[PDB]
């Protein structure tokens, strides 16, 4: 076996990707104009992937060596597995996305809206199924090879390496895996995010110096919401599972009591081992459920409403997972012992209640993102309508909106944390994070749908293929845009929940051989009353604000550098001949190290200067600040965009376009775009990677710091 | 001898106010010059009247509540503080709205710019000297009456009141005093701040004598009374926190030695440590008086920035020196200072005060750095105007988000070093040193509006260009020193709030902890899910609060746009109406969450609030000042070919209108939120440590 059965799920997911690829690839594209536009963007995507991958390779090697020297070789391998695993997923989804777009638009005419959705969604699913299969294939490998074969799940005492750096082997191994996933996420957001909006600015910046720099912007849409959103969600997914494993693993040395000079493990090996393996199996059942959710919607009789379709896959994947999960939990944790001490209030079933809380939190966090972002509800409506009072008002109201929009989703996270932890303690928080993300394949599938449609729509526009064809196309895109704001919203929620599990992980990972005496409560402690901790927290909040400010300026730097590649193309051409991607792609990368140094090196520097408490502080400031700003920037940016739309759909009598309010709404959307698509999504990654790195380096700086 | 000597300093400060008032009042004002002044002076009174009455109604309710749930002394202390800060604002405003006319006339009658500075600064000083004298007069009273006479500084143990609510009496008493100062600051910012920007918007939303006068009174409401009440609350907050930590150090450092309780830090030590910060602040006020008087009496200058600055530097150098003697001699043979956290014995906390002083100055520099055309960030913003309004907004948001790091790094280093010298007590003394010399800090603040009105009053009257030159210059300097001022007041609010957080945790010690190790009782564990949730809740409340205030400003402005004391009263009334809500958030959040979920969660909430509020306060101050000064930059003539009209200028105008509510309403309100939420929590944790629901 029953267990191998589970362990081969990721393989079917991967083959399933391979099949959806096939079945889409065998779909056709129409006109030479339809093919030509696709290749523009498809080649455009490859160029960017090429340059980015090479940069990723260079950093991954250096990190791998470093891990191998300072921790253990297993950890460095695990790191590479994760880097290869997430890398692979992005590379596959993008290849799909940039080929499915043409075949959506042709679906919209050759077929005649439902069978165009059936195409788009099959495409979207290649990114989602690859995200699940790869991420879980990797963890299965690490569990099987380093955990079982090499016995890291059999020993799991506190190991001390050739430099006297001490850690629990498996905990450390999977921490490396997580770092691998993080680094490709970081590159995809802080690098690809700059590119994407650098393109959008540049395109949206014409004084007459179609088809000028549109293709860069069109690739951006895939870079951002296929690859970027996918890497983001992947990291949070692995982060949640890895954290469950790290807390479980360390529970072994924590729950020992000396009795007559024996060390008695109050939570025993069987329990720890099950608790380590459980989240993997939990996530596997999820993938199986998500495959059923995805396949169902593809094979299903078609609809006229693609939102309901996309949603049927989501709801289906989640109902399914809740049900099977409760059996998995009862049967898998039926007789373990020490679950009381472990934090399980209702014995065995406890963490399932936690997973469920996370699931519902995720969905609610989705609803809130829609609520604050969709004309259709009040906040955006109001924003939209205030346009008649001017650009200042539009800006001030949008800032006001997003600042307020932070409360409902956060209350939802607060209640989720409280309840998660009521059922199953800190382990329960991480399992809730995992439940929140348990149907990640389907979540990611609906995300990737957005750009496929967006390109499909634009391709219709560039080609000017009919109006009747264009109607289905605009609708598909319209739905992309809603599901995309829900998507960003859900991915910020999951980033916060994952980061908070990784913070629990950071503290658990500090247990030393010399603590095995002490009470759990003296070892599982970060005291906020400590000045180092207060300082840490302040430093981390400010670093997060800096990071965000820097990324805005980065986007505007790169855009402008492109305009000039345009300007030198248009100064070159019109004089003689009437009237890229790599350039801005290269500058996006160049202007990335700096953010990446902040993300990766901040724990290291502050850790080696001031130690584990201060870094504990830093991680807390970072998550608190980052959680809030991520939400503010998503919502403000979304609201501003959908407000512009609102008037464009003619919901303000007598204004509908190039009018003074429309202009004011355009200016808000231009301020908003870098916030929603670059700042917020980068912060998701910052609040995670900074934690993973810390989890690993606290091996060294608990003991070896300067002051 | 030195006892009463020190305790009468606040009285001299107050007489000194009364003298600067007199010597200004005797200064003269044209009919146009008088008429405009009265418009704005009457305008100010109208607003003060409506606000005070509102304050009164809330302060009575809070006082009876304090008397029922804690002790009557606490309620009295609360009222003393409310009366004390209230009084200061009323005095500084009366002065401001009369000094303005006599600056402008100075600029012509007296015929030059240095003796107009001498007027303006004398005016400014009434607000500053009143702030110090009142705040300290109060604390002296509480120390003398409740501490000494009624023996609260003699008795010192853990008292349990008629409802079984337990607390250390003096700690609790001064916590009330702090709440009083907080309430009037809250009203002055979250109420007066909405008025001031409601007025600015409305005026800037009607391009053609509008009841702009409202906007001119706003300038006083905001930077005389509001900045003043803000700084006052941080000042008292820092002193009170020093006292709270000291007081609780008594039950904290007890060893259970074979069924006796042995106080490892003894009454003499505690009592000095309670009294020390008061005396420290008193020496400061004395020094600030010398700083203020020196600059007034001084031979005049051509440069009023140097003047204002001479008073600051003079007040601070002076304080550093005398303070060292005060510290050595007052704590020299004290005992148990080791256990208290004093790394270098007696002198230790002086090193802490010094760190705070320098932090304050640096935090000032940063504010200027991110806000003044003259330096790179604002220059760049200004020159990006040629690329559009979007760019101006994005670059300004980008500027302020970045501008947070240097001043925060300054706080981080300050906290680390404060605590290295003298522990958590040292952090609070750092906050106090930062804010020692507060009279002179507040004097330079109040100078700004006095000049601003002074300038405007020249512009409305049309009195010469040569006269107008001195005027514009005076105002020009006001605007720089105001940005430094905001910047310093945010720094002090954070340092205060962090002390009050320390105070919040100290205040939870129970009779049943008097055995336990300090380290098991002075603990808020971040690994606890309640604490994590708390922090997230508090950070979200803070963002909400800020959002709500933006919207409040635009609501009231618009209310004005639809149509001079009535017009001031209408929007003044709505400003108050639209205040309860923020005030509920500030005051009631600890109570609701405390009674639901307890002390740890609220500990969380407070941490989120401070961290989030500190960052947003800085962002908004700097981005707002940047935008303003970038508009100015082009207005002085700096891109070339563009000026006071033109598409970039328009774009800079739009950024300044987005900025104005952020720098003058959101940020300064956040200073208060991060403080009052703590003071309230310090007090109500008496009850909800024990009595909460889940
Ligand atoms: Ca947009
Ligand atoms: Ca302004
Ligand atoms: Mg597009
Ligand atoms: Mg004015």
From Swiss-Prot, chain A:
Has 16 transmembrane helices and a cytoplasmic domain that contains the active site. Pyrophosphate binding is thought to trigger a conformation change that allows Na(+) release. Has at least two binding sites for Na(+). It comes from Thermotoga maritima (strain ATCC 43589 / DSM 3109 / JCM 10099 / NBRC 100826 / MSB8). InterPro entries: PPase-energised_H-pump. Residues 22-45, 97-120, 196-224, 299-309, 369-394, 453-481, 561-582, 640-678 are cytoplasmic. The gene is hppA. Coiled coil: none annotated. Its cofactor is Mg(2+). It catalyses: Na(+)(in) + diphosphate + H2O = Na(+)(out) + 2 phosphate + H(+). Inhibited by GdCl3. Requires K(+) for maximal activity. K(+) greatly stimulates Na(+) binding. Thermostability depends on the binding of Mg(2+). This is K(+)-stimulated pyrophosphate-energized sodium pump. It is a multi-pass membrane protein. The keyword Chaperone does not apply. Ca(2+) binds at residues 641, 669, 673.
């Amino acid at each position: 076996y029953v267990a191998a059965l589970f362990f081969l799920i990721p393989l079917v997911a991967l083959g399933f990707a391979a099949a959806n690829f096939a079945a889409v690839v065998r779909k056709p594209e129409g006109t030479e104009r339809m093919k030509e536009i696709s290749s523009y963007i498809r080649s455009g995507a490859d160029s960017f992937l090429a340059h980015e991958t090479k940069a990723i390779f260079k950093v991954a090697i250096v990190i791998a060596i470093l891990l191998m020297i300072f921790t253990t070789w297993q950890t460095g391998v695990a790191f590479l597995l994760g880097a290869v695993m997430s890398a692979s997923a992005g590379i596959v989804g993008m290849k799909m996305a940039t080929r499915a777009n043409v075949r959506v638009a042709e679906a919209a005419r050759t077929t005649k809206i439902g069978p165009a959705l059936k195409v788009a969604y099959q495409g979207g699913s290649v990114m989602g199924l690859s995200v699940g299969g790869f991420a879980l294939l990797g963890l299965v490998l690490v569990y099987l090879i380093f955990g079982k074969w090499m016995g890291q799940v059999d020993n799991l005492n506190i190991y001390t390496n050739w430099l006297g750096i001490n850690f629990v082997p498996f905990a450390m191994t999977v921490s490396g895996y997580a770092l691998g996933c993080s680094i490709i996420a970081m590159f995809d957001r802080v690098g690809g995010g700059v590119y994407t909006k650098a393109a959008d600015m540049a395109a949206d910046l014409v004084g007459k110096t179609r088809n000028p720099a549109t293709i860069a912007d069109n690739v951006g849409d895939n870079v951002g919401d296929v690859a970027g959103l996918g890497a983001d969600l992947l990291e949070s997914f692995v982060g949640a599972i890895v954290s469950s494993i790290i807390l479980a693993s360390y529970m072994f040395p924590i729950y020992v009591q000396k009795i007559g000079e024996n060390l008695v493990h109050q939570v025993p090996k069987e329990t720890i081992q099950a608790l380590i393996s459980y989240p993997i199996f939990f996530a596997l059942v999820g993938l199986g459920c998500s495959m059923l959710g995805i396949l169902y919607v593809i094979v299903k009789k078609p609809s006229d409403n693609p939102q309901r379709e996309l949603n049927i896959s989501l709801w289906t994947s989640a109902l399914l997972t809740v049900v099977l999960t409760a059996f998995l939990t009862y049967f898998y944790l039926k007789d373990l012992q020490g679950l009381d001490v472990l934090g399980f209030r209702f014995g065995a079933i406890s963490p399932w209640f936690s997973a469920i809380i996370g699931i519902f939190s995720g969905i609610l966090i989705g609803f809130w993102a829609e609520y604050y972002t969709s004309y259709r509800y009040k906040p955006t409506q109001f924003l939209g309508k205030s346009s008649i009072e001017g650009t200042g008002m539009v800006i001030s109201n949008g800032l006001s909106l997003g600042m307020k929009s932070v409360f409902p989703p956060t209350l939802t996270l607060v209640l989720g944390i409280l309840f998660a932890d009521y059922f199953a303690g800190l382990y329960g928080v991480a399992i809730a994070a995992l439940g929140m993300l348990s149907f990640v394949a389907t979540s990611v599938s609906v995300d990737s749908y957005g750009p496929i449609a967006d390109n499909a729509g634009g391709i219709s526009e560039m080609c000017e293929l009919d109006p009747e064809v264009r109607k289905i196309t605009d609708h598909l895109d319209a739905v992309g845009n809603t599901t995309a704001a829900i998507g960003k919203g859900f991915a910020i929620g999951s980033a916060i929940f994952a980061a908070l599990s990784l913070f629990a992980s950071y503290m658990f990972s500090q247990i030393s051989p010399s603590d095995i005496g002490k009470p759990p409560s003296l070892v599982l402690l970060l005291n906020m009353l400590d000045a180092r901790v207060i300082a840490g927290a302040l430093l981390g909040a400010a670093i997060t604000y800096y990071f965000s400010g820097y990324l805005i300026s980065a986007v505007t730097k790169a855009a402008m550098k492109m305009v000039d590649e345009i300007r030198r193309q248009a100064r070159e051409i019109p004089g003689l001949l009437e009237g890229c991607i790599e350039i801005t792609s290269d500058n996006a990368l160049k202007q990335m190290g700096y953010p990446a140094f902040i993300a990766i090196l901040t724990p290291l520097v502050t850790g080696f200067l001031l130690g584990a408490e201060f870094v504990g502080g830093v991680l807390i400031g970072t998550v608190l600040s980052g959680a809030m700003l991520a939400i503010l920037t998503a919502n403000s940016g979304g609201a501003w965009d959908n407000a512009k739309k609102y008037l464009e759909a003619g919901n303000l009598e007598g204004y509908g376009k190039g009018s003074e309010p429309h202009k004011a709404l355009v200016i808000g959307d231009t301020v908003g775009d870098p916030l929603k698509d670059t700042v917020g999504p980068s912060l998701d990654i910052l609040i995670k990677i900074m934690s993973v790195v810390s989890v690993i380096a606290v091996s060294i700086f608990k003991h070896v710091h300067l002051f």
